[PDB]
Structures are given as C-alpha cells and as structure tokens.
C-alpha cells in the first residue's frame, strides 16, 4: 500500500526543508535590502569626496593667487622703501650743506660789518686830519 | 497520486543550497564595503585638513598683504615729505648762494673803498707833519 505509508515521511520531509528555506530567504532578502542601504551610503559618499576635491583644488588655487599678492605688494614696500632711504639721503645731504654754507655767510658778513667800521673809523680819522691842516695852513702858507 | 515522487523537495532544497552560499556571498560583499567605508572615511578627513589648510594659508595672506598695504601707505607719504624737505632745503641751498655772492661783491668794493680812505688819509698826514716844519 506504501503510496501514503510513506507520503507521510514525503509531506513531512518538505516541512523540514521547507522552512530552512524560509528562514534562509528571510536572511536573503535582508541582507541584500540592508545592504543596498550601506552601499548607496558609499555613492553618496564617493559624490561627496568628488566636490570636496574639486573644492580642495579652489582653495589651493585661491591661496596661492593670495600669496602672489602679497609677495607683489611687499615686493613693492621694498622699493618704497629703499627710495626713502634714498630721499631721506638726499635732504641730509641737502641739509648739511646749507649748514655750512651758513656759516660761510656768517664769517664774511663779519667780515664785512667788520670791513664797515674800517671806514667809520677813517672817515673819523681823515675829517679830524682835514680839518687839522686847513689848521696848520691857515696859521701860515696858504 | 504518486506523492509526485517528493523529489519536489529539490525545488525548494536546491534552492536552499543555492541561497545558502549566495549569503555567505554577501558577507562577503558587505566586508569589502565595510573596509572601502572606512577608507573613504579617511580620506574625507585628510580632506578637511587640507581644505582648512588652504583656507588658513589664504586668510594668511589676506591679512599680510593689509599689513603691507598700510605700510606702504606710510612709506610713501614718508617719501613724500622727504622730498619736500630735500626739495625746500635745495631752494635754501640756493638763496644763501645768492646771498654769499651779493655780500661778497659788497665786501670788496667796500675793501677798496678803504685803501682809498687810506691813502687820502696818507697824504693828508703826510703833511700834518708837514705844516708843522715851524716849533720854535
């Protein structure tokens, strides 16, 4: 009769199997839904390195247009400066100058106040000296 | 009729080795993702250093070149004030060329006007002395 005998032990051997499947596929789907989760974090993740290197590549840029800049105008404030030393030399030269030719002007004027008594002094002497001879040449000659 | 042979029990047993290897196929697919995870964790850190890296250097500059272009302004309106001064002491250096020249014209023909007081001056004493030929 066994057609049943043992159909029981067929029914009964897919019971078994059948729900190691089950609980298989419940791991299946899972893993691969949860999965799918972590690896969309992976594609958001590889975008966002893409822009921050192609922000990365601004800033680098950016900063080194910043430090030409600067090397341009100190560069400048080199020069600036070396032409005020320049100009600065150029009054105390300029300066020390004057300085002595003041003191030229200050000798000579002295002696010319100096030169300007000389002839007071004569003129002095000479109208005393006129007038003492029109003296002595009125008491005689002529 | 048959208990169509339980061998139907294949069509979910295959598929029981089948989708047994398939996850342990995923763990492995999920291992090689967990690893590129981390890696790519790293790197978006040495991108944040590096990125702040060039923000600072920038911020640097921006603010020593400002410290620069303040000095300049100085130096240059120093300059300008050397030059003026060096200008004006030029123009002194000249009036005082003039001067020392238009006293040292005056100086000689005032010199001359003495050697003339002095010889007038020597005749006329020349001859004091002369009028005096009479004491007694």
Do not use: P
């Not at 020390?96 to 100096?114: D, F, M, P």
């Not at 008594?117 to 006129?130: F, P």
Request: glycine share 2%; with cysteine; hydrophobic share 35%.
């Amino acid at each position: 009769q066994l057609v049943e005998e043992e159909l029981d032990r067929a029914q009964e051997r897919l019971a078994t199997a059948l729900q190691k499947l089950e609980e298989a596929e419940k791991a299946a789907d899972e893993s691969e839904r949860g999965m799918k989760v972590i690896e969309s974090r992976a594609q958001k993740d590889e975008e966002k390195m893409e822009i921050q290197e192609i922000q990365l590549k601004e800033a680098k840029h950016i900063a080194e247009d910043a430090d030409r800049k600067y090397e341009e105008v100190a560069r400048k404030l080199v020069i600036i400066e070396s032409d005020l030393e320049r100009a600065e030399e150029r009054a105390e030269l300029s300066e020390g100058k004057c300085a002595e030719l003041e003191e030229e002007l200050k000798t000579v004027t002295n002696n010319l106040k100096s030169l300007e008594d000389k002839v007071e002094e004569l003129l002095s002497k000479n109208y005393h000296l006129e007038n003492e001879v029109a003296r002595l040449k009125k008491l005689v000659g002529e």
